[PDB]
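Limitations
The structure tokens in this dataset are predictions for the assembled complex, not deposited experimental models. Users should treat interface geometry with appropriate caution, especially where small molecules or nucleic acid strands are included. An illustrative entry is reproduced here so readers can see what is and is not provided.
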Amino acid sequence: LKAQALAIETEAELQRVQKVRELELVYARAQLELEVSKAQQLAEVEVKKFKQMTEAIGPSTIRDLAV
Amino acid sequence: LKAQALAIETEAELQRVQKVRELELVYARAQLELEVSKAQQLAEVEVKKFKQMTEAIGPSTIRDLAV
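Predicted assembly:
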């Protein structure tokens, strides 16, 4: 009889753990694409701002700011 | 019976956690585009202000301010 109750509460527990973790995995990957969305989109403003003012000086004079 | 009540309060809890986090994800990505909106738009005033006064000196004389 002690094994019957161990099966009942094991069935109950795994129904919950499964139903929880599967739903938490949806939230986990939504945070990811939002994280990736940020890192790549702030990397655009970094590159483009570097590219604009790298040509203003010119890639012929920038070699003469640390000699 | 203890497993019935564990299913009832697990169903209740996950209905809330799901409904909360899904709505918080909307606010989370609205803060992002506003963050990206700032970083790129203040990077314009930085580049353009650098570009205007980089030509005033001229990219032929700026090499002679640290020799």
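Some entries come with short summary sentences. For this one: Residues 5 and 21 of chain A are 24 Å apart (CA to CA).
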